[PDB]
Every structure is written in C-alpha cells, then in structure tokens.
C-alpha cells in the first residue's frame, strides 16, 4: 500500500504502464454550456466505478495549443498509467477530468471562473464525488476531496485556480508553469499567502505538489517562485503530507514534454486526498 516519503524522487512509470490495461476506466466525452459558451471535457471514471460510492476528483489542464482531448490522446496516454496504477493498488480509484481553457472568452488565466460556476456543478452533479450537492456550500464542504493540476499554460491555470478557489479545492499540482501575478517571486508568494489568509484555512487544509524537469525551461521562473513560497510560514516543505503541505519535484534531465510530465502525475497523484480521508488507511 502507499506510504508517504518526505522527499519523494522522480521515477517514471514502468514502460508497460504506457500500454492499455485490461482493467480500463471509462472515458466519457461531455459537453456543457457555461459563461464561455458551449464547451467539452473528458471524464475518466476508474475501473469498477460505482455511483453509490464517493470518489475523489482531480481536474487536470492541458498546455498551450492543446485541448480537452490531449491528455487521453495517443500523444500522452495518461489513462493507461491511471489504469495500471489503480489496478496495482498504487493509486486509490478516483475521477480525473480533463477540461479546456479554450473557447469563447476563456483563457488559461481566467478559466477558474468557469471552473467554479459551470464545470464543477456540471461534472459533480452527474458523477459521484464527495459533493453531496453542487451548491457553493456543497462544493466547499467537499474541498478536501477535490484537486486541480495542469501543465505549462495549464500550470498557470492551476496557480490562478489556487488563489481564487481555495474554498473549493485543497490539492494543487502545478506542472512546469509559474504564477504570472506579480513583478517578483515575492509578489507571487505574497499573493498566494494573501489568498490563504483570506480563506481562513489552516496549513493542514491545502497542499501543493509542484513539479518540473531540470531541463524544462519552466524551471527558470518556477524555481524562484518555489523558493519565495518556502520562506512563507504558510507552507511546511516536505512531500510527507501527513506532516507538511508543500513539495517541488524536479526530474533530472527531463524536458518540456508530456512524455515526461505524465510521469510527474504518476509520482504525485498517489500523494493526494489522504488527509482527513473517510477510509481507515495507514500511509
């Protein structure tokens, strides 16, 4: 069974995990209408999905030039990794949603508004998450069971989601993207700190697992931000989320490509959703 490490290291999923698994989760293409017009997304349901059980949910955003289909396309194949990891007990079953910041007036920076108003209620009123209802109250009450992450421009999306949606989301996975709000790393960290202040949340109620590659140009602006965030009292640096709430995984030699980034998800996603979980697990 999964056990937290305090300084988890980069490790790719075995090559066999990139091939289809017999215990395949179902991927459902959905279309909805929101503040940015009619748009689509994909919903990965785990193998064995039972709508009378409750699942954690992770929303995962593509990068620049991509779309809601990329992550489950032949160019990434994340579903194969998810399938194999869940089958082998490395990852607890959960719902994974791949939306898009394309369409209408939407941008990577402003997607959080559509996320709050349209995406969460649409998805979580159709599929069984810990949200008993999808009113603002129902979404907020299930925040410990909701995560957001994304790559590149989708990492930027993640940071804007964090600063504007702490009330709705507890776990964040920014991959190869920095937060564009501010003229210095301190401005950036302070903005995040101010959001945490406003939320009233404790340090045991939000968690950030950031990652990039040592040869990924995102590192240049990410690293300084991470360092500034480390200096804040709001974050306790360690991958052991039973103790702290902030980690930055840097994959040696990895470049700005989903071929690597998919493994960051393999490495990090198993770390999410255990704190205050409703199951009796030892991690």
Curated annotation (Swiss-Prot):
Domain of life: Bacteria
Family under the similarity heading: Belongs to the glycosyl hydrolase 10 (cellulase F) family.
Descriptive protein name: Endo-1,4-beta-xylanase Y
């Amino acid at each position: 069974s999964f056990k937290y490490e305090s300084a988890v290291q980069y490790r790719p999923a075995p090559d066999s995990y990139l091939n289809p698994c017999p215990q395949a989760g179902r991927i459902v293409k959905e279309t909805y209408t929101g503040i940015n017009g009619t748009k689509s997304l994909n919903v990965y349901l785990p193998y064995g999905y039972d709508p009378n059980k409750k699942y954690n949910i992770f929303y995962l955003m593509h990068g620049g030039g991509e779309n809601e289909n990329t992550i489950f396309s032949n160019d990434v194949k994340l579903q194969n990794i998810l399938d194999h990891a869940i089958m082998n007990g490395e990852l607890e079953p959960l719902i994974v949603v791949t939306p898009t910041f394309n369409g209408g007036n939407c941008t990577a920076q402003n997607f959080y508004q559509e996320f709050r108003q349209n995406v969460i209620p649409f998805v979580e009123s159709k599929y069984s998450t810990y949200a008993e209802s999808t009113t603002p109250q129902g979404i907020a009450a299930s925040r410990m069971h909701r995560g957001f992450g994304g790559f590149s421009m989708g990492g930027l999306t993640t940071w804007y989601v964090m600063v504007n949606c702490l009330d709705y989301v507890a776990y964040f996975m920014p991959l190869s993207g920095d937060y564009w709000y501010g003229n210095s790393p301190q401005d950036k960290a302070n903005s995040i700190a101010e959001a945490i202040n406003r939320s009233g949340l404790s340090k045991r109620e939000y968690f950030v697992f950031a990652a990039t590659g040592s040869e990924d140009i995102a590192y240049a602006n990410m690293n300084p931000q991470i360092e500034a965030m480390k200096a804040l009292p709001h974050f306790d640096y360690t991958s052991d989320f039973s103790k702290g709430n902030f980690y930055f995984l840097v994959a040696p030699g990895a470049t700005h490509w989903w071929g690597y980034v998919r493994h960051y998800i393999y490495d990090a996603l198993p770390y999410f959703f255990h704190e205050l979980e409703h199951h009796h697990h030892h991690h």
